Design an enzyme around this catalytic site. Structure first.
Site, mmCIF file in Angstrom:
data_model
loop_
_atom_site.group_PDB
_atom_site.id
_atom_site.type_symbol
_atom_site.label_atom_id
_atom_site.label_comp_id
_atom_site.label_asym_id
_atom_site.label_seq_id
_atom_site.Cartn_x
_atom_site.Cartn_y
_atom_site.Cartn_z
ATOM 1 N N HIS B 41 0.841 -1.221 0.000
ATOM 2 C CA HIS B 41 0.000 0.000 0.000
ATOM 3 C C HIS B 41 0.872 1.266 0.000
ATOM 4 C CE1 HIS B 41 -0.467 -0.197 4.614
ATOM 5 N NE2 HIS B 41 0.275 0.879 4.314
ATOM 6 N N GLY B 143 2.302 6.286 9.510
ATOM 7 C CA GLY B 143 3.748 6.247 9.242
ATOM 8 C C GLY B 143 4.408 5.012 9.837
ATOM 9 N N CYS B 145 3.407 1.842 9.477
ATOM 10 C CA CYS B 145 3.258 0.661 8.593
ATOM 11 C C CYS B 145 4.647 0.199 8.133
ATOM 12 C CB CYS B 145 2.287 0.921 7.451
ATOM 13 S SG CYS B 145 0.569 0.871 8.036
HETATM 14 C C1 LIG Z 1 0.430 2.405 8.978
HETATM 15 C C2 LIG Z 1 0.711 3.516 8.012
HETATM 16 O O1 LIG Z 1 1.772 4.118 8.091
HETATM 17 N N1 LIG Z 1 -0.223 3.794 7.076
HETATM 18 C C3 LIG Z 1 -1.557 3.187 6.953
HETATM 19 C C4 LIG Z 1 -2.633 4.243 6.965
HETATM 20 N N2 LIG Z 1 -2.316 5.194 5.891
HETATM 21 S S1 LIG Z 1 -3.510 6.012 5.121
HETATM 22 O O2 LIG Z 1 -4.679 5.192 5.156
HETATM 23 O O3 LIG Z 1 -3.546 7.332 5.666
HETATM 24 C C5 LIG Z 1 -2.955 6.114 3.442
HETATM 25 C C6 LIG Z 1 -2.730 7.359 2.859
HETATM 26 C C7 LIG Z 1 -2.281 7.443 1.554
HETATM 27 C C8 LIG Z 1 -2.031 6.303 0.825
HETATM 28 C C9 LIG Z 1 -2.223 5.056 1.387
HETATM 29 C C10 LIG Z 1 -2.673 4.955 2.698
HETATM 30 C C11 LIG Z 1 -2.881 3.649 3.269
HETATM 31 N N3 LIG Z 1 -3.159 2.639 3.736
HETATM 32 C C12 LIG Z 1 -1.030 5.872 6.115
HETATM 33 C C13 LIG Z 1 0.036 4.812 6.054
#
Ligand SMILES: *CC(=O)N1CCN(S(=O)(=O)c2ccccc2C#N)CC1
Ligand SMILES: *CC(=O)N1CCN(S(=O)(=O)c2ccccc2C#N)CC1
Lengths: 304, 304
Positions: B41, B143, B145
């Site tokens: 993702h 951030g 992930c």
């Molecule tokens: C855990 C982590 O750092 N993330 C998961 C949640 N996202 S988000 O849902 O804000 C997102 C924003 C833009 C593009 C993809 C995602 C996703 N999933 C931030 C990242």
């Protein structure tokens, strides 16, 4: 989201742990620059421990009696001195992994990470608080002495604790890195009783703020209170008195949540008087007091 | 003495964390040998996340679109592939700090340490369990992930989890390091509800053994039970069924304490039926289920 009892990453401290052996006693030492810090009781026989005279015991010890091993490499001891309850072993090699560091003496209520070690090898890391009675509630077996407690500010490790002793009640006592015990404890095998282990009120309030931020809100009520009224209830439940200094420290969590500190005091008052009625807050059935306001902000903001 | 929720020392994993950026999304990657592992993702816009077609999104991405930073040094990406829900970014430099490692897929009830990271930088370490519903209860902000979960057997890091997702109920879902989600979860921003979060019975029993070993004995009673009788009470309280496999696994803790597993089951039965009556066990007002029997033996024996 989610809120966990979180230790600092331990790598910078793993890089500092060595084994110290004097005769038959093996424990842990902290290698920073060309000095290895360890508990002075490394020089005792378990018999010595009943009434040790450390200056007298030390006279019989030479540099070559202190066996210092970093991994499976021996360090050369070129000097030794006693500072309070720690030995400082000068070695001929600076620890190449020495992080930026400070020695700090923390106040009761302050939290820190412990890297539990045996034979100079890390076994695990956990979060502690200096209790109001100057004990910590650790996890320490024989051989864990000289394991250290620390905070990290970005790249600078502040060492605040070295492990020396288990009281007969299974709680822990130790020193700062200048070898001064927290509280009234001594490195002697004698009758030493801890005072009242009171609850760190400002830490509980911080943790209630953390709960609200992470969606646990069931305990929020329609009441407020005053510092003096709250403190009457605090005294009765063996909670530390709340000061305006503590209120000022909770200001940022107050601002983020829009809950006045004194309103959250009133929530805590009702929890003390009414109990949890079989409910939980952030996965706990009791009020957690080993998160500082600083801890809650750090974890909720994601500092590295 | 003392028993703490203890994470593995994190240094070996700190040495593997990098930052991965694709367009405007920044998360964490795991650098082992010349491969960086991260959540697929990373390639999505938050809009993409509603109904992403990862193969289609990936077609628009080149090696040079994946910005990989280890400290403040950029790594050269020379290849990229998707394996299930992770990306494998081949880089031109082997991680010089690569520990001995394995990829393992853990079972529900198994515990592991999480190194929470932001922008490839460690913020903290905590102990988790894979819940019976294949969620974890973590502490993860935007951030975080690509933060990983791991066990250590002496010098070999077994990576079991990579963080991908927070469900609307604030619990966490992720993959093994082959990119297969634990449980039925998908990396899409959609209605995903966790099933029953049952209590890990064998872990609670382990923790009762830990309590007895550390002098918390007030809950020991005069009763025994059978697996079938116990299991009736387990079902009623949303505890996992206890199997003879679990009983066999508790054997060493049984032997050390001289308390038959089924006797300790009977203690746990009375605790479920009667509650704690405002008492604590190892500093907890509820029955802890995030220590495995292996965890209890490790911490009580002092393995490094
Ligand atoms: C855990 C982590 O750092 N993330 C998961 C949640 N996202 S988000 O849902 O804000 C997102 C924003 C833009 C593009 C993809 C995602 C996703 N999933 C931030 C990242
Ligand atoms: C924490 C730790 O590793 N130790 C403290 C407890 N001792 S001991 O009391 O068994 C002991 C034995 C011989 C000599 C000195 C001491 C002390 N203190 C083990 C070390």
């Amino acid at each position: 989201s989610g809120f966990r009892k979180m230790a600092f990453p331990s790598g910078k401290v793993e890089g500092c742990m060595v084994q110290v052996t004097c005769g038959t006693t093996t424990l842990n030492g902290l290698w920073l620059d060309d000095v290895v810090y360890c508990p002075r009781h490394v020089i005792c026989t378990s018999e010595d421990m009943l009434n040790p005279n450390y200056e007298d015991l030390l006279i019989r010890k030479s540099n070559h009696n202190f066996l210092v091993q970093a991994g499976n490499v021996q360090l050369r001891v070129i000097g030794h001195s006693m500072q309070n309850c720690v030995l400082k072993l000068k070695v001929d090699t600076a620890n190449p992994k020495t992080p930026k560091y400070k020695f700090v003496r923390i106040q009761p209520g302050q939290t820190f990470s412990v890297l539990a070690c045996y034979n100079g090898s890390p076994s695990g890391v956990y979060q502690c608080a200096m209790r109001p009675n100057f004990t910590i509630k650790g996890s320490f077996l024989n051989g864990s002495c000289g394991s250290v407690g620390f905070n990290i500010d970005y790249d600078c490790v502040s060492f605040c604790y070295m492990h020396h002793m288990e009281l007969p009640t299974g709680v822990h006592a130790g020193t700062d890195l200048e070898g001064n015990f927290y509280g009234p404890f001594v490195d002697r095998q004698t009758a030493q009783a801890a005072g009242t282990d009171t609850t760190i009120t400002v830490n509980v309030l911080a943790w209630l703020y953390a709960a609200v931020i992470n969606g646990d809100r069931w305990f929020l009520n329609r009441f407020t209170t005053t510092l003096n009224d709250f403190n009457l209830v605090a005294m009765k439940y063996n909670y530390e008195p709340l000061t305006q200094d503590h209120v000022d420290i909770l200001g940022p969590l107050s601002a983020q949540t829009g809950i006045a500190v004194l309103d959250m005091c009133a929530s805590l008052k009702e929890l003390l008087q009414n109990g949890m009625n079989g409910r939980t807050i952030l996965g706990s059935a009791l009020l957690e007091d080993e998160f500082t306001p600083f801890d809650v902000v750090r974890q909720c903001s994601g500092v590295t």
